Amino acid sequence: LYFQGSLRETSEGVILSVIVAPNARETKIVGIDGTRGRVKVNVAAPPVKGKANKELMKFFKKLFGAEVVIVRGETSREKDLLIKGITKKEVIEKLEL
Ligand code: NA
């Protein structure tokens, strides 16, 4: 399994497709879902008042050094994140760290 199955590069940056589990001990990448083409992300926040979405975005903004917005799935576990102004090569390097 490679992270490439969860990413695609658009004119605006990289869409990173994730599947979250809230209430986690630590916000971190725990795996890849090879059927859904998504990175499994544990989020150390409750899924109330948008707090899991906020923590998810904060985690990836820090990892990538780039603005991260949710473009689909604000109220779903399966969320698509636009990482603005970054290339797929840069995203792969950071996910592989
Ligand atoms: Na949330």
Q: Are 22 and 49 in contact (CB under 8 A)?
A: no
Sign of CA dihedral 27, 30, 31, 35: negative
- 28 CA → ligand 1 middle, Å: 16
Q: Of the candidates 23, 24, 21, 39, which has an alpha carbon nearest to the alpha carbon of residue 96? A: 39
Q: Which residues surround ligand 1, an ion (CB under 5 A)?
A: 47, 50, 52-53
What was the structure determination method?
A: X-ray
Distance 76 CA to ligand 1 centre (A): 9
Q: How far is the CA of 42 from the centre of ligand 1 (A)?
A: 12
How many domains, the chain?
1
What distance in angstroms lies between residue 69's CA and the mean position of ligand 1's atoms?
13
CATH value at residue 47: 3.30.1200.10
Tokens of 33: 């879902």
CA distances for 54 relative to 28, 37, 60, angstroms: 14, 22, 10
Which phi and psi (to 5°) does residue 47 adopt? -85, 50
* Residue partners of 16: CB distance under 8 A and separation at least 6: 6, 7, 39, 60, 80, 81, 83, 91
Expressed as residue numbers, the domain containing 65 is 3-96
